[PDB]
Every structure is written in C-alpha cells, then in structure tokens.
Amino acid sequence: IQAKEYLENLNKELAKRTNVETEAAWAYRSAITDENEKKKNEISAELAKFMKEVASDTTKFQWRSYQSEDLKRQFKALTKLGYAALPEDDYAELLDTLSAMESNFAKVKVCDYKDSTKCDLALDPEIEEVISKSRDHEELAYYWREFYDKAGTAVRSQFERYVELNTKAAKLNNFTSGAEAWLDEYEDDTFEQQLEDIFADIRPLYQQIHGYVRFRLRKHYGDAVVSETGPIPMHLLGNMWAQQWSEIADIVSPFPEKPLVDVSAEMEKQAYTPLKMFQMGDDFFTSMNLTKLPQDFWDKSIIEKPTDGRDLVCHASAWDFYLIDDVRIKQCTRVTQDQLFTVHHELGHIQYFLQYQHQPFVYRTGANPGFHEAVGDVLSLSVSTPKHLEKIGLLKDYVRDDEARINQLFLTALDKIVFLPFAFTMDKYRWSLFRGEVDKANWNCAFWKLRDEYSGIEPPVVRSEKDFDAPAKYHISADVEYLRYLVSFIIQFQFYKSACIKAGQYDPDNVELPLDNCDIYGSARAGAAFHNMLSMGASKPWPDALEAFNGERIMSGKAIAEYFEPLRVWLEAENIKNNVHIGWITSNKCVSSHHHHH
Ligand SMILES: C[C@H](CS)C(=O)N1CCC[C@H]1C(=O)O
Ligand SMILES: [Zn+2]
C-alpha cells in the first residue's frame, strides 16, 4: 500500500504543529516571563502526545519491508521519538528542569568589580567585553569566578536529573544512551573514531600555538601569573570558556607592529550598524546567486539587544518557522569584527532554511548537524581575508608583507585550530555522563581533567567537586549538542577549498592565488555548488550531500592543515628561536575544600 499519501499529509501537519511550538519558543526567548515559559512548555507537551499517537499509527505501515527508500527513510526518522518517548509525567518534569537551567544562564548578573553597587552587568554586553579587553589578571579572575558560580554551580541538581531523563529517553528509543543518540545524527558507526583521528593529525599544530601564546602571556603578565610548562590560566585567553583566543591578539600576535587585521575599530569609526552588517551579509549570498533574505526576516528579526529592562536569551540564533519565507534571527549584535562573522554564521543557517523549504518537513533540516553550522562560516572565511576587507574599504592601505600573512593565518588559528579541542571536550564530557562512565562524586573534575588533557587550559582559581562548572557554557545549560561545531570547523574548510577552486581564486600549483586569500564573493559556480548541497536537506545521508558539493564523500583534515601550513612551519622555527616550551604538566586546580578559618 502507499503511505506516500500518509507521510505527505503527516509532514504537512507536523510542520503546521511545529510552527505553533516555534512561536512560543521564540516569544519566550525574546522575553523571559513565567507565562511565556508556561505556554512554551505547554505546546511541547501537546506536540509530544501527538507524536506518541502518530508513532503508534505507523505500526499500520510495515516500512521495515517497503520498496523505495526516502519513504522508507521518512518513517525511520519520524518514528525516532526523542524526549517525546518519555511518559507524560517525565517529559513534563524534563521540560521544567530544562527550563530551569536555560533561564538561570540567561538571568545571570554580577556586580561591577570597581562598584559593588551596580550588580546589573550581564554576560553578553558587559562581561564579555571585560574578559575581552581587561589586562588585569585579578579583575578577569573576579569576573571568571563570579560568572561560573552563578551559571554552573547553582544548577548542578537540575543538570543531574537532566542526564537521568536524557538517558531514560534514549533507552526508550533503542539507543544505548543520550550519547549514542546524538552520534546517530551522523549516520556512521565509526564517526567518533574518524574525529579522534583527525584531532590527532592537527594536535601537533595545536601544540605550537599553545606554547607560543603561553610564551607571550607569560612574557606580558609575568612568571608569577603565567608559568612555563604549566597549563594556561583561562580568564587570560580573552574568552569566558577559552574556546577562541583572537581577542588577545593585541598582546600575543607575532606582528602587532605589522598591520593587524582588526577591522573592528575601523567599523566603529565608519558608523557601521547592525542593520548595515546584515545587509552586507545579505549581499554575499545574492552575489553567489544564492537566495536573498525575505520580507518577514527584516520585519520579524531582532538584530539589536532590546533596550527595556526585560530578560531574554541573547545567545545568537536563527529560526525556521516551517512555512514559506518566515525565517528570523535574534541577535544582540554589536559592531565588532567577531560579530560580523557571527551575522554571516547565522545567515548561513537562514540560507539553508530557504534552500530546503520545498522539502517534506521531516527532511527540512541539515544533512548531518555539522553542515548547518558550516555554511555561514565559509563565507566568513572569505570576509576575513585582506582581499575582501580592502575591497569593501575596511582596510585602507595594506601590504601583504609576508609577516603580515603570518598574522592573517595566526589570527585565524586562535578561532579555528584552538576551537577543535574545546568542542571535542564539550561532548566527550557529556558523552561520558550519558554513558555511566563517571561517578557523580567526580562530575566536576572529569570536566576539568578533560579540559586539561585536550586543551592545556585550567581555571583561574582552584575548584572542587563542590563546584559544577560545565553549565557556564550556554550549550550545556540549553541542552544543545556541541559536536556539530567540531565537525563544522573541519569540513567548512573542505567547502571553502572547493568553492575557491570552482571560483577562479585558488590554484594549488602556482602562488599569487593562496588559499588564505580567496574571496568567492560574487562567485556563481560557488553558490551553484552550495545550491546542489543545501537544497537536499536531510533527504539523503550526508556523504551524498557533500558529493553534490564537490564529488567527494569523506570528511577529512585535508583542508585546515593545508590552509595553516605556512603558519605551522613559521612556528616550529619561532618556538626554537625563543626557546618555547611545548606540552604541559597535569593541572592542580581540581581538588576539594580547604579553608583557613579556625
Ligand atoms: C551562535 C552559534 C550557534 S548558531 C554558536 O553557538 N557558536 C558559533 C561558534 C561557536 C559557538 C559558540 O558560541 O559557542
Ligand atoms: Zn550555528
């Protein structure tokens, strides 16, 4: 019998019913009120029951024996019930606990280090600016400590029941745990190992940047503050979680003398605005014959932090309302070079949305979560190059010295190479929890030992099992899988390298056309490749989506390394010239107790 009629009917409903859920999720996250929180959870509970019933109806159709896939593909996916598999009581309890951590994160406020009266400083604007600009280790320590105690510790209990229900829901779907359930999204039994492999190839590179940054930081802050051979004290790497270090390029770039690609201040001087930035981002896509932003986007998107005293979630995000042309972004945008990439990052999501609207709801997602987080980053890479920044006048007079090129790759290494091990630890940690590998009595150290092993970083002050820091990371609090980023930072280079080749910008043979300097801006063959891939949306396992992009079907490290080759070689020499220590000894920042009040 034909269920193509069934599925078509059903997807159309799901897309209708998810629309409702999406408007409540979006109202909440634009204005955190209990009422909005209640409506939001209400809708999901409702949707959850529909799914349960929709799931039992499919027992009618024995698709495990059907003929054509796609159809046979839509059932395997529509019957994979996530948290909705949980009985009524638990699903609701999960939503509550899930709401608790999300709003706790977003509602954090600390008191200004030099004015204990204020206490209205928030993470997005204020704190992120301090961690990023201050050069007083004691002040960055203050803000580190103040933020991790509120954002992580305060929500340890909820986080524990979250893992419990997460696990419960995963066994309810025939998965080993929540861990193996996330991995399933990549449809490949050897995925984790492929990633463990690639990380190994780039690690050596990671351990040359590490010792170097540590060299300057220690030269700048001093021996007493940063020690040689020891892991790098966070709070000093310019990022609350140390996932990216570009913010401290003013003190660790090898050539601050040679032009620094810091368009950030030339932006502010030119009166750049959030709106202008989105429009610039709209341009790149249309330049590539990609789809232009629809009218609902400019009408509904929130692109600047609301000015009232209301609470909201401001960790940038893009929304697919599952209709036709109703896509919106919510960003607390600021005029700075990092935010500029972010806009593009977000538009990468929007693009994908538009690219697969026609697809049956079930397939309206990304081929492999990795693909979703990479689109917009590929354009960002182009925008970051001297070529494209001069072309738009955000870099007046610039000379490609040679040692100016080193900066152009080094400033990129702090966000792209450096990130690889951070994102890997994020899920390795949550995987070890989902799997019963760790004892609740060691939950907070496993996280730090893990930040130690892979990143060589440690907290500003001693923490203990009394604290719980993992939740200080938005995604841990909001339950958002993180492996998608690791995969993105790898393959986004695979995309970029092919785009530039299809575009007349990259030639491996001769020079004058180096990978780190193509712009693909205005490239039609590029957007073309980007259309064959995006338009598919989950309709096929990812090896097929990629193959639609460049004929290849494998994920590899042959992209970042080739891109950062000139940097890697420049460092080895430099590290011997300065006698720079490589590698680090285990950390002494995870313990338990100890006070001097007798
Ligand atoms: C806003 C995006 C997701 S749409 C995000 O969370 N990113 C982008 C890069 C890293 C990571 C982060 O902020 O931790
Ligand atoms: Zn994203």
Curated annotation (Swiss-Prot):
Q: What keywords sit in the KW lines?
A: Carboxypeptidase, Disulfide bond, Glycoprotein, Hydrolase, Metal-binding, Metalloprotease, Protease, Secreted, Signal, Zinc
Where is carbohydrate linked to this protein? A31, N174, N289
Q: Name one GO molecular function term.
A: metallopeptidase activity
Q: Which family does it belong to?
A: Belongs to the peptidase M2 family.
* Tissue specificity remark: Expressed in vesicular structures in spermatocytes and early spermatids (at protein level).
TM ranges are: none
Entry protein name: Angiotensin-converting enzyme
One short Pfam family name for this protein?
Answer: Peptidase_M2
Q: How is its activity regulated?
A: Inhibited by captopril and, to a lesser extent, by lisinopril, trandolaprilat, fosinoprilat and enalaprilat.
The EC number(s) given in the record are 3.4.15.1
